[PDB]
Amino acid sequence: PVNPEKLLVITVATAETEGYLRFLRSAEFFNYTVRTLGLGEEWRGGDTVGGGQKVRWLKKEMEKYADREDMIIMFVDSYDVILAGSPTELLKKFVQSGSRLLFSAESFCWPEWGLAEQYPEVGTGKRFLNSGGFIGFATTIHQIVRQWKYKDDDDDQLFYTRLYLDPGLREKLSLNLDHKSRIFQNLNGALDEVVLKFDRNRVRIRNVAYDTLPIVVHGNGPTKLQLNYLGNYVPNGWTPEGGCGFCNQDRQPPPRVFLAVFVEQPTPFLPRFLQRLLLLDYPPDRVTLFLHNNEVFHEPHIADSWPQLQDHFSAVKLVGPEEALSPGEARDMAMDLCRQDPECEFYFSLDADAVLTNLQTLRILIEENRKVIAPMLSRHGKLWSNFWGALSPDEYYARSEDYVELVQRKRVGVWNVPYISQAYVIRGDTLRMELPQRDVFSGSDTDPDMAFCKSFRDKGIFLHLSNQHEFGRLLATSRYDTEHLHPDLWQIFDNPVDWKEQYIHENYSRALEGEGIVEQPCPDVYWFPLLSEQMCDELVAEMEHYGQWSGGRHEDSRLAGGYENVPTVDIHMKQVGYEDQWLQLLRTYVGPMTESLFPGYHTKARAVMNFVVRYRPDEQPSLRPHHDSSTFTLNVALNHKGLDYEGGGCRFLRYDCVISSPRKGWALLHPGRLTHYHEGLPTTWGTRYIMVSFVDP
Amino acid sequence: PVNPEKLLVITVATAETEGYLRFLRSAEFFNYTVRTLGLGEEWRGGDTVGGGQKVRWLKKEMEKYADREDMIIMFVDSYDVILAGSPTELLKKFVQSGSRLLFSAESFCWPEWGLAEQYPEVGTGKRFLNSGGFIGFATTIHQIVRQWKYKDDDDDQLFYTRLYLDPGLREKLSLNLDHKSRIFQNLNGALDEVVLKFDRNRVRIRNVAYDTLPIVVHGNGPTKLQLNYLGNYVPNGWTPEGGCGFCNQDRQPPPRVFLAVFVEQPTPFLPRFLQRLLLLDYPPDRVTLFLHNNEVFHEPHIADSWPQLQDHFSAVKLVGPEEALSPGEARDMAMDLCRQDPECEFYFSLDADAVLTNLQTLRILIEENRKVIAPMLSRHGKLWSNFWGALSPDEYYARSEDYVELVQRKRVGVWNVPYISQAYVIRGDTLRMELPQRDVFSGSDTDPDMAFCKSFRDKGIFLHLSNQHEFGRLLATSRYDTEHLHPDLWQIFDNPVDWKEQYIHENYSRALEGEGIVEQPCPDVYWFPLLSEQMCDELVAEMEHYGQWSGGRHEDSRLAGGYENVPTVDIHMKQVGYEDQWLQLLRTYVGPMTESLFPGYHTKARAVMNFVVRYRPDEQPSLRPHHDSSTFTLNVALNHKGLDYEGGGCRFLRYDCVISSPRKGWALLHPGRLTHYHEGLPTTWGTRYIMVSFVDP
Ligand SMILES: O=C(O)[C@H]1O[C@H](OP(=O)(O)OP(=O)(O)OC[C@H]2O[C@@H](n3ccc(=O)[nH]c3=O)[C@H](O)[C@@H]2O)[C@H](O)[C@@H](O)[C@@H]1O
Ligand SMILES: O=C(O)[C@H]1O[C@H](OP(=O)(O)OP(=O)(O)OC[C@H]2O[C@@H](n3ccc(=O)[nH]c3=O)[C@H](O)[C@@H]2O)[C@H](O)[C@@H](O)[C@@H]1O
Ligand SMILES: *[C@@H]1O[C@H](CO)[C@@H](O[C@@H]2O[C@H](CO)[C@@H](O)[C@H](O)[C@H]2NC(C)=O)[C@H](O)[C@H]1NC(C)=O
Ligand SMILES: *[C@@H]1O[C@H](CO)[C@@H](O[C@@H]2O[C@H](CO)[C@@H](O)[C@H](O)[C@H]2NC(C)=O)[C@H](O)[C@H]1NC(C)=O
Ligand SMILES: *[C@@H]1O[C@H](CO)[C@@H](O)[C@H](O)[C@H]1NC(C)=O
Ligand SMILES: *[C@@H]1O[C@H](CO)[C@@H](O)[C@H](O)[C@H]1NC(C)=O
Ligand SMILES: O=C(O)CCC(=O)C(=O)O
Ligand SMILES: O=C(O)CCC(=O)C(=O)O
Ligand SMILES: [Fe+2]
Ligand SMILES: [Fe+2]
Ligand SMILES: [Fe+2]
Ligand SMILES: [Fe+2]
Ligand SMILES: [Mn+2]
Ligand SMILES: [Mn+2]
């Protein structure tokens, strides 16, 4: 057994990039000893073929070990390598190979492809050398690297390849290749061969082609993204029993922050979004607000909330549609405002379609101490989120092996992902020292959101995505219909969660769960809060905006004294185009309320007659006794008694019972036939509005 | 002015028949003085041409007045004559004629038709002599009748005709004819010329051909029936202000009576008829009962009631179908039983289709002191009655000028009519002394009821019909369906009044009119008496007689917990063929009850689901919670709790209210949808029956 203390891992790194730090963490996890060559100096090794500087530094380092037969040295890259197994296991596998210097093997011959015939034949394994990782005795390695006498821009790979292809040297020093990836696993050309092998508190990779458990995972060539993926788990990235291994899990001045808000398309519930900005649990005197609105549709919305935002934050800036900025130039300008302000410690980009339910998001993200991190936001009950887990070869969306697991929060942690959007927090120093260019989001025909992620990947920055907590959701903005007086009224299908929070009474849900909010003012007439004040005001407004009320000749489905049809001044939902929306409200909220209050009854909230009635002393103030063409009737007040009108009660003749004082939010549920002959009392002043549905006719 | 004391009216009469008495009443009304020739002796004047005995008696009477120029004598028939005007008016018209002996005129020449050319020409009046009525001076009349020297069977008319046709005698004695019916009105040949002229307290006839008001109405020849008609009014028969002038209007042992009951066809509600016989307000020890039943269908009905009838009356006799009697032979035998029993003072015939609502009928009729009298009975709300007012020439039904007035009781009194049926009271002495033949109803191919009336008309007996009171009604027996276990159950259409009295609860009507019989045991569940005990027992019985109850696979229109269809063991009205009948009950009795209890609601009692449920511990004892496919539900108990079954209540879950003890007559009205989730509690012993209708589905 070779003493693990005789093993030394040597690697090259000119800076402490996240990839290098990721490498060290994996090495520290297995208690490896690591010598890092070239931390101070800068990389003259080029971009293409190169890395000759690697050999020069190694040749110098080796001279102090030139006679150490007792020393085993392993050389590996650091930016694109993670370790997966112990020094003890690594040394056992090395001795098993009977080699004195074992290079990693790969599927391709590079750079000179024609040398492929000088290589020995290998039945089913990888055939060619890869200088990304080799291991051998110090004496043997010294005899190899000693022969370096070339430029820093020359090909380190070709240097080793030429030595290995020397048949006499190959067998005199007994050099070998790890054909079946027992120790070194190069990913390029082998993606379909590699899968994660999980354990309780550590994760490995398994090669299913050769049924081996490699030690060194090298994401060489165009496999940086796959290595990022594997590196979220291997070795202690994320474990079934330990969870994430580098994030917070369990949560005196906070840093100054530049908050940038982007309205790049017509967005539902923007007033609610702007209102929510005042509620983020981050001291606003430490926040600077930049808001780009591109939509003339939203100029009134922004204008209404701007005085509150200016009072709230320490500094504010609006760039409206009159400036003719594209999304790419707007996001460039916002990010560059933080870059050029040394007091900007963090940059927080937030799009209008991002709904943050966790007011602590900025804190949580800032405390995770990453260069770039984004909270995971999902469309309600669907898989689409604000991140991608994988990329198609030509940089389109692809589903990663673990995407659904992350979106469904079956695995939670902070993940290295190739694409993030809609919300993210960027270290200010990173903008200053690593991405100093202005053209982050633009300068190409590429989409701005993709150009942003590409810009950071090209610099080797990690794009982190936290689903460690519930952060929020994403609004559906696809086909938002803007041609209404109040478009958010028509949003009950696309954004039902947000639609409920805005338009359903706040105490509806607790009234549905009992708690004694529902009342029964008259026998079998139930009274419950249904619509919020905003819904009523907006619904009345949309009716008056149509403005074509009924009158003479109007026929309603009421029954009074045989055939003397009883009319109302009203507008039917069908006329204003809101029928399908109202039926959906009936299905979702009135049905279950009815089935709770009338145990035994079942309904699917069928309604042919849905309409808003107007009562005025000047036209039709009252509604004479009658029955309804309905199994039950929904009677929703839409404005305040006293403030808006006087009188106008609802009277149930057979019970000598009167709803004298209706409530603006509240609905009456009463039977429509046989027992509940009712009349609407006269409206003596003002205007009275109610919403009526003859359901289950 | 001729002194009315010088006027003497002479007539002939061998007996005091009703027609002669009718004549005298009219004469006494105008204070005429009347000499009646030949009361003691018998009529040798024949049947054909005759009446010579009339002249012989007049010739003798005249000899004492042969020289009385101061005396005016009028000779008229008596059996077929009524007087219509005063002696004073009669004498004024006689003197106006300038005649010394004025004969009545008529349209026909009789007997010798060929003499028609010897008569003078008359422009528009009647041309020929009629010996039924003449008036003249006693001296002139004496000179005419003095010449009689012929047989008692010779033609009185030809004797006068021959004298009148003597041109010398005609103008020497100045004989004349009442061409234009100023005094004498002969009806034969002039029916269309004669109408009634009404006054406040007397009635006349007017001749519309000559616009005259005749004094003497002579129903000569085949006009006896028209004279009977006119004689009901003229002169004080019936008046607009005085009413009838010979009947009672205002009502120690009563006479012994033979009561004869006839069941000659299958008759509805015969058990009720037989029961009613015990209730006639006439002391039963004075009544003898004869009952002819021709229907084997009614033998059980007769048998059930016979012990009560035998105990009730002083003597009873049944002649059943085993005797093979026709209606004519049965009615002959019954009437002949009274004829041959001198203790039978009155004969009362009553058919099974005659319903006597006035228990005092026998008394009322007996106190009217007629030879034959019948109470007026009508089919409910129709014109058909138990009498005819007129006859077609070949003796079929015809509508008299005043028929509808009588049936509608616009004129009330005791009327001389040509045809009566179904109920009548006959003086026993009339059967003995005037109709002693056995063959009253039979002996011809004529219908028995017509042969009976013909038999009395041929003897000059009057058939009287009293509508002075409400007496009763006539059952519709036309197409009585006998092929049921209880045929009277299917009689709700033909005999709705009698059907209600038998099958609707006795207190239904008073519950409909308020009075606080209706109850409301649970909220909006109304409880009222609907069906009588007999209806329930007969309805259950008809169901079990069908005997094919539902079970597995049976599907009912109930709603419970979505789609888990709730069955009952039941029979639908459609299966036993009683649907149309039950819907009629719903329309007539459940509809108005529902509209009274739910003010505002209107219904026409539509019901697709009508069925009787059976509950037993051995098959289906209960009915789980559910709603009904109905606007409201009718739940009628059909038998007694305790006596017939145990347990089995009706429970309304949302109200925590239980109908623990239903009532056999009574119905529950409750809403079928939304509010009244109900379950039928288990039946622990016996059998429980209910009747259910899902009305207005
Ligand atoms: O850039 C290169 O020199 C190599 O990039 C690729 O091979 P790959 O394994 O994907 O390259 P990296 O692993 O990403 O970089 C080589 C090593 O040089 C070090 N390095 C690189 C870049 C740098 O700025 N500073 C620095 O220290 C890192 O240890 C890095 O791992 C090509 O296959 C080689 O032709 C080329 O020699
Ligand atoms: O039976 C008749 O002797 C007459 O009947 C008919 O004429 P009509 O006026 O209809 O006869 P009636 O008026 O019904 O009878 C003639 C009178 O004789 C008297 N009479 C008749 C029948 C009788 O039984 N007893 C009796 O006194 C009555 O006063 C009776 O009015 C015929 O036209 C005559 O041919 C016939 O002379
Ligand atoms: C929802 O329910 C809450 C609690 O029942 C209501 O809260 C109260 O509002 C009234 C008047 O607005 C105050 O007098 C109470 O002091 C409040 N109580 C609490 C605990 O806040 C609330 O008003 C209801 N929502 C609506 C829209 O009516
Ligand atoms: C119809 O109503 C009458 C009066 O309300 C009921 O008469 C009574 O019957 C009960 C028991 O049968 C007796 O205790 C009372 O003394 C009766 N009162 C009178 C005034 O007769 C009668 O029972 C009802 N009809 C039915 C079928 O129930
Ligand atoms: C690493 O070394 C420390 C002692 O320095 C030891 O406590 C720890 O268990 C080692 N970990 C592994 C994974 O060998
Ligand atoms: C008939 O005579 C009596 C007197 O005897 C007289 O009182 C009555 O008014 C008279 N009636 C008529 C109708 O002339
Ligand atoms: O409460 C009212 O004003 C009458 C409403 C009503 O009953 C109806 O819309 O038919
Ligand atoms: O009262 C009962 O027995 C249940 C009757 C009922 O509800 C039904 O027939 O549907
Ligand atoms: Fe309407
Ligand atoms: Fe209504
Ligand atoms: Fe049924
Ligand atoms: Fe039911
Ligand atoms: Mn590498
Ligand atoms: Mn006559």
Side-chain angles (χ1 to χ4, degrees), chain A residues 524 526 598 600-601 627 654-655 677, chain B residues 524 526 600-601 627 654-655 675 677:
Chain A
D524 285 323
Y526 287 97
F598 298 95
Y601 184 70
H627 285 297
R654 287 193 56 256
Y655 306 103
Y677 217 43
Chain B
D524 285 323
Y526 287 97
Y601 184 70
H627 285 297
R654 287 193 56 256
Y655 306 103
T675 53
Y677 217 43

PDB file of all heavy atoms in Angstrom, chain A residues 524 526 598 600-601 627 654-655 677, chain B residues 524 526 600-601 627 654-655 675 677:
ATOM      1  N   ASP A 524     -82.655  30.284   4.951  1.00  0.00           N
ATOM      2  CA  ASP A 524     -82.095  29.712   3.727  1.00  0.00           C
ATOM      3  C   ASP A 524     -81.575  30.767   2.758  1.00  0.00           C
ATOM      4  O   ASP A 524     -81.401  30.483   1.568  1.00  0.00           O
ATOM      5  CB  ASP A 524     -83.101  28.797   3.014  1.00  0.00           C
ATOM      6  CG  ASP A 524     -83.265  27.460   3.711  1.00  0.00           C
ATOM      7  OD1 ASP A 524     -82.252  26.941   4.227  1.00  0.00           O
ATOM      8  OD2 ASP A 524     -84.400  26.934   3.751  1.00  0.00           O
ATOM      9  N   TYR A 526     -78.214  32.712   2.475  1.00  0.00           N
ATOM     10  CA  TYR A 526     -76.870  32.788   3.023  1.00  0.00           C
ATOM     11  C   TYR A 526     -76.131  34.001   2.473  1.00  0.00           C
ATOM     12  O   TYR A 526     -76.372  34.444   1.347  1.00  0.00           O
ATOM     13  CB  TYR A 526     -76.095  31.506   2.733  1.00  0.00           C
ATOM     14  CG  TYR A 526     -76.556  30.345   3.583  1.00  0.00           C
ATOM     15  CD1 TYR A 526     -77.473  29.427   3.099  1.00  0.00           C
ATOM     16  CD2 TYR A 526     -76.090  30.181   4.882  1.00  0.00           C
ATOM     17  CE1 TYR A 526     -77.905  28.365   3.877  1.00  0.00           C
ATOM     18  CE2 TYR A 526     -76.517  29.121   5.671  1.00  0.00           C
ATOM     19  CZ  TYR A 526     -77.426  28.214   5.163  1.00  0.00           C
ATOM     20  OH  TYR A 526     -77.856  27.156   5.938  1.00  0.00           O
ATOM     21  N   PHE A 598     -75.271  24.287   1.573  1.00  0.00           N
ATOM     22  CA  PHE A 598     -76.424  23.414   1.362  1.00  0.00           C
ATOM     23  C   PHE A 598     -75.919  21.979   1.267  1.00  0.00           C
ATOM     24  O   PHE A 598     -75.815  21.419   0.164  1.00  0.00           O
ATOM     25  CB  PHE A 598     -77.206  23.816   0.113  1.00  0.00           C
ATOM     26  CG  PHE A 598     -77.779  25.204   0.180  1.00  0.00           C
ATOM     27  CD1 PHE A 598     -77.102  26.279  -0.369  1.00  0.00           C
ATOM     28  CD2 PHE A 598     -78.994  25.433   0.799  1.00  0.00           C
ATOM     29  CE1 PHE A 598     -77.632  27.556  -0.303  1.00  0.00           C
ATOM     30  CE2 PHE A 598     -79.527  26.705   0.868  1.00  0.00           C
ATOM     31  CZ  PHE A 598     -78.846  27.768   0.316  1.00  0.00           C
ATOM     32  N   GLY A 600     -75.504  18.297   0.697  1.00  0.00           N
ATOM     33  CA  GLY A 600     -76.324  17.428  -0.121  1.00  0.00           C
ATOM     34  C   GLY A 600     -76.420  17.904  -1.555  1.00  0.00           C
ATOM     35  O   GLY A 600     -76.441  17.093  -2.486  1.00  0.00           O
ATOM     36  N   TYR A 601     -76.473  19.219  -1.749  1.00  0.00           N
ATOM     37  CA  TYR A 601     -76.603  19.778  -3.087  1.00  0.00           C
ATOM     38  C   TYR A 601     -75.272  19.738  -3.823  1.00  0.00           C
ATOM     39  O   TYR A 601     -74.210  19.957  -3.232  1.00  0.00           O
ATOM     40  CB  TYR A 601     -77.121  21.216  -3.023  1.00  0.00           C
ATOM     41  CG  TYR A 601     -77.362  21.822  -4.387  1.00  0.00           C
ATOM     42  CD1 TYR A 601     -78.405  21.380  -5.187  1.00  0.00           C
ATOM     43  CD2 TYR A 601     -76.544  22.830  -4.879  1.00  0.00           C
ATOM     44  CE1 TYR A 601     -78.628  21.923  -6.435  1.00  0.00           C
ATOM     45  CE2 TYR A 601     -76.761  23.379  -6.126  1.00  0.00           C
ATOM     46  CZ  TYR A 601     -77.803  22.921  -6.899  1.00  0.00           C
ATOM     47  OH  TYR A 601     -78.019  23.469  -8.142  1.00  0.00           O
ATOM     48  N   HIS A 627     -90.229  35.342  -8.862  1.00  0.00           N
ATOM     49  CA  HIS A 627     -89.307  34.227  -8.712  1.00  0.00           C
ATOM     50  C   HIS A 627     -88.216  34.311  -9.773  1.00  0.00           C
ATOM     51  O   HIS A 627     -88.283  35.105 -10.714  1.00  0.00           O
ATOM     52  CB  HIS A 627     -90.040  32.884  -8.825  1.00  0.00           C
ATOM     53  CG  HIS A 627     -90.851  32.531  -7.617  1.00  0.00           C
ATOM     54  ND1 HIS A 627     -90.288  32.327  -6.376  1.00  0.00           N
ATOM     55  CD2 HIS A 627     -92.183  32.338  -7.462  1.00  0.00           C
ATOM     56  CE1 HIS A 627     -91.237  32.031  -5.507  1.00  0.00           C
ATOM     57  NE2 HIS A 627     -92.396  32.030  -6.140  1.00  0.00           N
ATOM     58  N   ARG A 654     -92.376  35.844   1.859  1.00  0.00           N
ATOM     59  CA  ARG A 654     -92.912  34.725   2.628  1.00  0.00           C
ATOM     60  C   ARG A 654     -92.285  34.595   4.008  1.00  0.00           C
ATOM     61  O   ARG A 654     -92.826  33.865   4.846  1.00  0.00           O
ATOM     62  CB  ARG A 654     -92.728  33.414   1.861  1.00  0.00           C
ATOM     63  CG  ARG A 654     -93.659  33.244   0.671  1.00  0.00           C
ATOM     64  CD  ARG A 654     -93.656  31.809   0.159  1.00  0.00           C
ATOM     65  NE  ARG A 654     -94.009  30.849   1.200  1.00  0.00           N
ATOM     66  CZ  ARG A 654     -93.131  30.070   1.824  1.00  0.00           C
ATOM     67  NH1 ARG A 654     -91.844  30.135   1.508  1.00  0.00           N
ATOM     68  NH2 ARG A 654     -93.540  29.226   2.759  1.00  0.00           N
ATOM     69  N   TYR A 655     -91.171  35.275   4.266  1.00  0.00           N
ATOM     70  CA  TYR A 655     -90.498  35.201   5.551  1.00  0.00           C
ATOM     71  C   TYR A 655     -90.543  36.511   6.323  1.00  0.00           C
ATOM     72  O   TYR A 655     -90.042  36.562   7.452  1.00  0.00           O
ATOM     73  CB  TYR A 655     -89.049  34.753   5.351  1.00  0.00           C
ATOM     74  CG  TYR A 655     -88.940  33.462   4.574  1.00  0.00           C
ATOM     75  CD1 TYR A 655     -88.563  33.460   3.238  1.00  0.00           C
ATOM     76  CD2 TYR A 655     -89.228  32.244   5.174  1.00  0.00           C
ATOM     77  CE1 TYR A 655     -88.466  32.279   2.522  1.00  0.00           C
ATOM     78  CE2 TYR A 655     -89.135  31.057   4.468  1.00  0.00           C
ATOM     79  CZ  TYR A 655     -88.753  31.079   3.142  1.00  0.00           C
ATOM     80  OH  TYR A 655     -88.658  29.897   2.438  1.00  0.00           O
ATOM     81  N   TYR A 677     -90.201  34.058  -2.927  1.00  0.00           N
ATOM     82  CA  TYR A 677     -90.740  35.254  -3.562  1.00  0.00           C
ATOM     83  C   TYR A 677     -90.075  36.488  -2.973  1.00  0.00           C
ATOM     84  O   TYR A 677     -90.181  36.744  -1.769  1.00  0.00           O
ATOM     85  CB  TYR A 677     -92.252  35.308  -3.338  1.00  0.00           C
ATOM     86  CG  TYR A 677     -93.060  35.847  -4.497  1.00  0.00           C
ATOM     87  CD1 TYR A 677     -92.783  35.458  -5.800  1.00  0.00           C
ATOM     88  CD2 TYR A 677     -94.124  36.714  -4.284  1.00  0.00           C
ATOM     89  CE1 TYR A 677     -93.533  35.935  -6.862  1.00  0.00           C
ATOM     90  CE2 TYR A 677     -94.879  37.196  -5.341  1.00  0.00           C
ATOM     91  CZ  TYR A 677     -94.577  36.806  -6.628  1.00  0.00           C
ATOM     92  OH  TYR A 677     -95.322  37.283  -7.682  1.00  0.00           O
TER      93      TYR A 677
ATOM     94  N   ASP B 524     -90.821  25.125   5.753  1.00  0.00           N
ATOM     95  CA  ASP B 524     -91.215  25.027   4.348  1.00  0.00           C
ATOM     96  C   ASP B 524     -91.650  23.623   3.946  1.00  0.00           C
ATOM     97  O   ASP B 524     -91.674  23.300   2.753  1.00  0.00           O
ATOM     98  CB  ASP B 524     -90.106  25.522   3.410  1.00  0.00           C
ATOM     99  CG  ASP B 524     -89.985  27.033   3.398  1.00  0.00           C
ATOM    100  OD1 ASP B 524     -91.036  27.705   3.482  1.00  0.00           O
ATOM    101  OD2 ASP B 524     -88.847  27.548   3.315  1.00  0.00           O
ATOM    102  N   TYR B 526     -95.012  21.678   4.233  1.00  0.00           N
ATOM    103  CA  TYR B 526     -96.412  21.832   4.588  1.00  0.00           C
ATOM    104  C   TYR B 526     -97.117  20.483   4.601  1.00  0.00           C
ATOM    105  O   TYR B 526     -96.759  19.564   3.859  1.00  0.00           O
ATOM    106  CB  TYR B 526     -97.109  22.798   3.634  1.00  0.00           C
ATOM    107  CG  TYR B 526     -96.716  24.237   3.875  1.00  0.00           C
ATOM    108  CD1 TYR B 526     -95.722  24.840   3.123  1.00  0.00           C
ATOM    109  CD2 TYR B 526     -97.326  24.986   4.874  1.00  0.00           C
ATOM    110  CE1 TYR B 526     -95.352  26.157   3.345  1.00  0.00           C
ATOM    111  CE2 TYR B 526     -96.963  26.307   5.106  1.00  0.00           C
ATOM    112  CZ  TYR B 526     -95.974  26.888   4.338  1.00  0.00           C
ATOM    113  OH  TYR B 526     -95.607  28.200   4.558  1.00  0.00           O
ATOM    114  N   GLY B 600     -97.062  33.415  -4.506  1.00  0.00           N
ATOM    115  CA  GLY B 600     -96.126  33.812  -5.537  1.00  0.00           C
ATOM    116  C   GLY B 600     -95.876  32.714  -6.548  1.00  0.00           C
ATOM    117  O   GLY B 600     -95.722  32.983  -7.743  1.00  0.00           O
ATOM    118  N   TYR B 601     -95.841  31.467  -6.084  1.00  0.00           N
ATOM    119  CA  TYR B 601     -95.571  30.343  -6.968  1.00  0.00           C
ATOM    120  C   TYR B 601     -96.805  29.988  -7.784  1.00  0.00           C
ATOM    121  O   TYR B 601     -97.934  30.044  -7.290  1.00  0.00           O
ATOM    122  CB  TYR B 601     -95.107  29.126  -6.166  1.00  0.00           C
ATOM    123  CG  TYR B 601     -94.726  27.949  -7.037  1.00  0.00           C
ATOM    124  CD1 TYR B 601     -93.584  27.988  -7.822  1.00  0.00           C
ATOM    125  CD2 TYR B 601     -95.510  26.805  -7.081  1.00  0.00           C
ATOM    126  CE1 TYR B 601     -93.232  26.923  -8.625  1.00  0.00           C
ATOM    127  CE2 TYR B 601     -95.165  25.736  -7.880  1.00  0.00           C
ATOM    128  CZ  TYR B 601     -94.026  25.799  -8.650  1.00  0.00           C
ATOM    129  OH  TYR B 601     -93.682  24.732  -9.446  1.00  0.00           O
ATOM    130  N   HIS B 627     -81.833  14.323  -2.981  1.00  0.00           N
ATOM    131  CA  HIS B 627     -82.733  15.347  -3.490  1.00  0.00           C
ATOM    132  C   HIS B 627     -83.694  14.734  -4.502  1.00  0.00           C
ATOM    133  O   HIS B 627     -83.540  13.590  -4.936  1.00  0.00           O
ATOM    134  CB  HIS B 627     -81.951  16.494  -4.142  1.00  0.00           C
ATOM    135  CG  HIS B 627     -81.277  17.404  -3.164  1.00  0.00           C
ATOM    136  ND1 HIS B 627     -81.976  18.158  -2.245  1.00  0.00           N
ATOM    137  CD2 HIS B 627     -79.968  17.688  -2.964  1.00  0.00           C
ATOM    138  CE1 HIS B 627     -81.127  18.862  -1.518  1.00  0.00           C
ATOM    139  NE2 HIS B 627     -79.902  18.595  -1.934  1.00  0.00           N
ATOM    140  N   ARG B 654     -80.974  19.057   6.850  1.00  0.00           N
ATOM    141  CA  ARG B 654     -80.500  20.422   7.050  1.00  0.00           C
ATOM    142  C   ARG B 654     -81.280  21.176   8.117  1.00  0.00           C
ATOM    143  O   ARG B 654     -80.819  22.232   8.562  1.00  0.00           O
ATOM    144  CB  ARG B 654     -80.553  21.203   5.735  1.00  0.00           C
ATOM    145  CG  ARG B 654     -79.484  20.813   4.727  1.00  0.00           C
ATOM    146  CD  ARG B 654     -79.384  21.829   3.596  1.00  0.00           C
ATOM    147  NE  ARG B 654     -79.127  23.180   4.087  1.00  0.00           N
ATOM    148  CZ  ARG B 654     -80.048  24.135   4.156  1.00  0.00           C
ATOM    149  NH1 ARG B 654     -81.291  23.890   3.761  1.00  0.00           N
ATOM    150  NH2 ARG B 654     -79.727  25.335   4.617  1.00  0.00           N
ATOM    151  N   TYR B 655     -82.436  20.668   8.535  1.00  0.00           N
ATOM    152  CA  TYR B 655     -83.253  21.325   9.540  1.00  0.00           C
ATOM    153  C   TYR B 655     -83.338  20.544  10.842  1.00  0.00           C
ATOM    154  O   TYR B 655     -83.969  21.022  11.792  1.00  0.00           O
ATOM    155  CB  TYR B 655     -84.654  21.580   8.982  1.00  0.00           C
ATOM    156  CG  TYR B 655     -84.633  22.341   7.677  1.00  0.00           C
ATOM    157  CD1 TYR B 655     -84.850  21.694   6.468  1.00  0.00           C
ATOM    158  CD2 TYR B 655     -84.381  23.706   7.653  1.00  0.00           C
ATOM    159  CE1 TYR B 655     -84.827  22.388   5.270  1.00  0.00           C
ATOM    160  CE2 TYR B 655     -84.354  24.409   6.462  1.00  0.00           C
ATOM    161  CZ  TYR B 655     -84.579  23.747   5.272  1.00  0.00           C
ATOM    162  OH  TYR B 655     -84.555  24.447   4.084  1.00  0.00           O
ATOM    163  N   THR B 675     -82.428  22.819  -0.926  1.00  0.00           N
ATOM    164  CA  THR B 675     -82.490  23.052   0.513  1.00  0.00           C
ATOM    165  C   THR B 675     -82.929  21.843   1.332  1.00  0.00           C
ATOM    166  O   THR B 675     -82.582  21.765   2.518  1.00  0.00           O
ATOM    167  CB  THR B 675     -83.433  24.218   0.828  1.00  0.00           C
ATOM    168  OG1 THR B 675     -84.710  23.985   0.220  1.00  0.00           O
ATOM    169  CG2 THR B 675     -82.850  25.531   0.313  1.00  0.00           C
ATOM    170  N   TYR B 677     -82.519  18.279   1.574  1.00  0.00           N
ATOM    171  CA  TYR B 677     -81.945  16.942   1.655  1.00  0.00           C
ATOM    172  C   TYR B 677     -82.711  16.119   2.678  1.00  0.00           C
ATOM    173  O   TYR B 677     -82.755  16.471   3.861  1.00  0.00           O
ATOM    174  CB  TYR B 677     -80.471  17.047   2.053  1.00  0.00           C
ATOM    175  CG  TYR B 677     -79.550  16.045   1.395  1.00  0.00           C
ATOM    176  CD1 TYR B 677     -79.660  15.757   0.041  1.00  0.00           C
ATOM    177  CD2 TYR B 677     -78.544  15.417   2.118  1.00  0.00           C
ATOM    178  CE1 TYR B 677     -78.805  14.855  -0.568  1.00  0.00           C
ATOM    179  CE2 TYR B 677     -77.686  14.512   1.516  1.00  0.00           C
ATOM    180  CZ  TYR B 677     -77.823  14.232   0.174  1.00  0.00           C
ATOM    181  OH  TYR B 677     -76.973  13.332  -0.430  1.00  0.00           O
TER     182      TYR B 677
END
